[PDB]
Ligand binder design. Structure first.
Ligand SMILES: *[C@@H]1O[C@H](CO)[C@@H](O[C@@H]2O[C@H](CO)[C@@H](O[C@@H]3O[C@H](CO)[C@@H](O)[C@H](O)[C@@H]3O)[C@H](O)[C@H]2NC(C)=O)[C@H](O)[C@H]1NC(C)=O
Ligand SMILES: *[C@@H]1O[C@H](CO)[C@@H](O[C@@H]2O[C@H](CO)[C@@H](O)[C@H](O)[C@H]2NC(C)=O)[C@H](O)[C@H]1NC(C)=O
Ligand SMILES: *[C@@H]1O[C@H](CO)[C@@H](O[C@@H]2O[C@H](CO)[C@@H](O)[C@H](O)[C@H]2NC(C)=O)[C@H](O)[C@H]1NC(C)=O
Ligand SMILES: *[C@@H]1O[C@H](CO)[C@@H](O[C@@H]2O[C@H](CO)[C@@H](O)[C@H](O)[C@H]2NC(C)=O)[C@H](O)[C@H]1NC(C)=O
Ligand SMILES: *[C@@H]1O[C@H](CO)[C@@H](O)[C@H](O)[C@H]1NC(C)=O
Lengths: 285, 283
């Protein structure tokens, strides 16, 4: 059954500092004891992140633009987002993608969906069990169907502060959705915790559609569909050049944006992080 | 240069085997005018359940496509023939099957597996649900079916049989269990290459030799030896500080091999001169 949220309040659009996040393993190649300049879609350092906080009845989950790729990050205790809707118009006019976590597994289908105008995760809030994913009722012209492993998912109103910080990287690349995941164990209350963090690949998804937009699916925490306190974040992947440092283990320890300041492009030039006092010829203009 | 001698081809564990026990050993097959378009795709059509068996009379490919099956979305077209119609499951061969029941071409076909179903299809009095066409207004074109029991007339008159110049096109095969070999039923499946592929050719890791290789996507000459490079679980193969490939995780057994060059180098000749000697020591 497609129903909507009722107590929909006004959005946030809070700006954040993207300080040292969004770095990931782009290929499936092992390199170590090295230093590697390359260009791909990336998060610009210290850039603006639009934050979507969930305060008492703010259902801050519109259809959000995607265009090449996005960053989902969320300081979570109750995991109030467990779903995303990929596509152009999302409805059963064209082929769209739903990736949701029904508290049992991650179920993924790419079909023409009869979407709700405000889809949500039906959860009894003080009991903590997800009852139904009130997202689509019918699916048509299905092209790919995925079911993850079954796992028990904490879906209650968690008290205390946010213990989980997932990082997500979503890329529409030539029929393929690439889904990457990172994690920080956190204990935070406020804006956006700074820190270096990496991601790893999980998914190559031959869904095969146009994805210009995406829809964030909140979890409805109701005892009438309701909330609990969380926040989540939207960033943009941009086609720029990074130089990345691999340890002996082939683990990213350190990387540098080229676009930040002329200091940074200099570091990209000489292929080092330690630059002597002097004057250095760099790129012309 | 030292010329390599050896071949290390390794593939992963073979992906999804085609249900040959449930398509090429299935319980429900039609006649030959109406082949069952058993759609199989994204699979490994290896014939391996069936090529090493004693059910099958023909093994006729155009099950040697255990080697060379790698084609498009192949519908595993399946059917039941007369004993004399066993030989005609081939390209051309202008008999009852190719003219009126189902014409076969000589490009997009796999293997004819014609196995004995005397105690599955036939009775002591005759299986009369299986019919063949022996007359039609025009012979068939390749991969075409004709299910219609057409009120046949050999000169174009409108026909309601059994009136004048009116025949029935579908003749019964006559599947007995107490007849000779020529009127025994074979359940047969023939591939129509309309995506499935074949199995994986996989062999030894001949370590510490100058060999050729072909892993799952990586070719060349090399010297293979195990390594201590801690790959991550998502990692296909490794590259050096420069951009050449030097290490690979084995696609079947996940061993982290090292890849070295095969060998080469320069040669000097050391000599005291032609006026002193004619032996030299090479370097
Ligand atoms: C790559 O990852 C491995 C982790 O498996 C790192 O190896 C670990 O490094 C630490 C310190 O660098 C070692 O701790 C040492 O332990 C000994 C006794 O166990 C202790 O006496 C020392 O004071 C020190 O605490 C740890 O043992 C070692 N692990 C292994 C399996 O050797 C490695 O350092 C990473 N590579 C780089 C470049 O960091
Ligand atoms: C993030 O966006 C804000 C505005 O939404 C940018 O802040 C302003 O930028 C303009 C032009 O650069 C300056 O003239 C203002 O002084 C800035 N105001 C504040 C309060 O910072 C900000 O520059 C953006 N972030 C980045 C990294 O460019
Ligand atoms: C491919 O198949 C082989 C054997 O069919 C697998 O080898 C087994 O590997 C497991 C652990 O990976 C061992 O516990 C077994 O002892 C191995 N089998 C034998 C007979 O020794 C191999 O793991 C498979 N490949 C992958 C990637 O799983
Ligand atoms: C090779 O060496 C021999 C020396 O063993 C040369 O022969 C002598 O050369 C000297 C002067 O060069 C003469 O005085 C001798 O009469 C030569 N002896 C003989 C038997 O010929 C020889 O000329 C050298 N040849 C070359 C091409 O180097
Ligand atoms: C810091 O860099 C300067 C570069 O001129 C160098 O002279 C100095 O030795 C460095 N500091 C230390 C503690 O070595």
């Amino acid at each position: 059954r497609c129903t909507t949220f009722d107590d929909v309040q006004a959005p946030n659009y809070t700006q954040h500092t993207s300080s040292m996040r969004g770095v990931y393993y782009p290929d499936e190649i092992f390199r170590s004891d090295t230093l590697y300049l390359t260009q791909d879609l990336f998060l610009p350092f210290y850039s603006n992140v639009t934050g979507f906080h969930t305060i008492n009845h703010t259902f801050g989950n519109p259809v959000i633009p995607f265009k090449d790729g996005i960053y989902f990050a969320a300081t979570e205790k109750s995991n109030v987002v467990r779903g995303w809707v990929f596509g152009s118009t999302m409805n059963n006019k064209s082929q769209s993608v739903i990736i949701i976590n029904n508290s049992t597994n991650v179920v993924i289908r790419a079909c023409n969906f009869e979407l709700c105008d405000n889809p949500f995760f039906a959860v009894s809030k003080p009991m903590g069990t997800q009852t139904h994913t009130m997202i689509f009722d019918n699916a048509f012209n299905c092209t790919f169907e995925y079911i993850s492993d079954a796992f028990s998912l904490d879906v209650s109103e968690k008290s205390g502060n946010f213990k989980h910080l997932r990082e997500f990287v979503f890329k529409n690349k030539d029929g393929f959705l690439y889904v990457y995941k990172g994690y920080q164990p956190i204990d935070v209350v406020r804006d956006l915790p700074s820190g270096f963090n990496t991601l790893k690949p999980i998914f190559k998804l031959p869904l095969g559609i146009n994805i210009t937009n995406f829809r964030a699916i909140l979890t409805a925490f109701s005892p009438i569909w309701g909330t609990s306190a969380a926040a989540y974040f939207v960033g943009y992947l941009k086609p720029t050049t990074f130089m990345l440092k691999y340890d002996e283990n082939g683990t990213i320890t350190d990387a540098v944006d080229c676009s930040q300041n002329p200091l940074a492009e200099l570091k990209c030039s000489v292929k080092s992080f330690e630059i002597d006092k002097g004057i250095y010829q760099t790129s012309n203009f | 240069r030292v010329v390599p001698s050896g071949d290390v081809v390794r593939f992963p564990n073979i992906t999804n085997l085609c249900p040959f026990g449930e398509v090429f050993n299935a319980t429900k097959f039609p006649s030959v005018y109406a082949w069952e378009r058993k759609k199989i795709s994204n699979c490994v059509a290896d014939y391996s359940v069936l090529y090493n068996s004693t059910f099958f009379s023909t093994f006729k490919c155009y099950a040697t496509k255990l080697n060379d099956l790698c084609f498009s979305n192949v519908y595993a077209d399946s059917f039941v023939v007369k004993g004399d119609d066993v030989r005609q499951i081939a390209p051309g061969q202008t008999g009852v099957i190719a003219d009126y029941n189902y014409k076969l071409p000589d490009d997009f076909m796999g293997c004819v597996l014609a196995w004995n179903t005397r105690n599955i299809d036939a009775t002591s009095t005759g299986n009369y649900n299986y019919k063949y066409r022996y007359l039609r207004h025009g012979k068939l074109r390749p991969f075409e079916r004709d299910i219609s029991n057409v009120p046949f007339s050999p000169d174009g008159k409108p026909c309601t049989p059994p009136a004048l110049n009116c025949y029935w096109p579908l003749n019964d095969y006559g599947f007995y269990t107490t007849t000779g070999i020529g009127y025994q039923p074979y359940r047969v499946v023939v591939l129509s290459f309309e995506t499935v592929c074949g199995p994986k050719l996989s062999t030894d890791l001949i370590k510490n030799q100058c060999v050729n290789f072909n892993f799952n996507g990586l070719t060349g000459t090399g010297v293979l030896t195990p390594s201590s490079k801690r790959f991550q679980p998502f990692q296909q193969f490794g590259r050096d500080v420069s951009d050449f490939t030097d290490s690979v995780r084995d696609p079947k057994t996940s061993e982290i091999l090292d890849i070295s060059p095969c060998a080469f180098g320069g040669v000097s000749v050391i000599t005291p001169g032609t006026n002193a000697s004619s032996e030299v020591a090479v370097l």
